[PDB]
Amino acid sequence: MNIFEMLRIDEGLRLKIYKDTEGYYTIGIGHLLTKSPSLNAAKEELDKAIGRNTNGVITKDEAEKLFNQDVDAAVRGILRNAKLKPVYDSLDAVRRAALINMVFQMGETGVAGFTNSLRMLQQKRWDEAAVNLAKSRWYNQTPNRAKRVITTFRTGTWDAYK
Ligand SMILES: [Cl-]
């Protein structure tokens, strides 16, 4: 298992514009298009992202290209961020994938907001971090996915995805 496989399980693959769990227009493997409620504004962003006139439908290859870009962006966001980088550097390979997952979902700035939990992780206090992460809106809104991420942090194994 690796980060791509993990996020593909968490986000799914949809080739037609859809609404994410929060009602925002998205496409492919969790690629957010826009928070505007306008489907046309979504369609427009999609055309610009892909470089072609799509009418709301993309191919598998195009979804995978957006995915490659989004994973690369998450990783560079971690490495650039003063709060996130030291945490990433402290972690083992599996737990690193879990942090990438969160950044992909919530954004660099959002994850950097989990100060307390990040510290716990850096200190390798797995159980304490797991308990703290579960108090968040994140956990309450998307509990099945958050539990998988938390378990990965708790154990350092890919068991929640097996
Ligand atoms: Cl993009």
mmCIF file of C-alpha atoms and ligand atoms in Angstrom, residues 31-32 49 66 69-70, ligand 1:
data_model
loop_
_atom_site.group_PDB
_atom_site.id
_atom_site.type_symbol
_atom_site.label_atom_id
_atom_site.label_comp_id
_atom_site.label_asym_id
_atom_site.label_seq_id
_atom_site.Cartn_x
_atom_site.Cartn_y
_atom_site.Cartn_z
ATOM 1 C CA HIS A 31 -10.159 17.129 -6.775
ATOM 2 C CA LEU A 32 -12.088 20.142 -5.498
ATOM 3 C CA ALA A 49 -7.758 22.543 -15.059
ATOM 4 C CA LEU A 66 -5.038 15.867 -11.543
ATOM 5 C CA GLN A 69 -0.597 16.988 -9.242
ATOM 6 C CA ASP A 70 -2.689 17.088 -6.003
HETATM 7 CL CL CL B 1 -5.365 22.041 -10.429
#
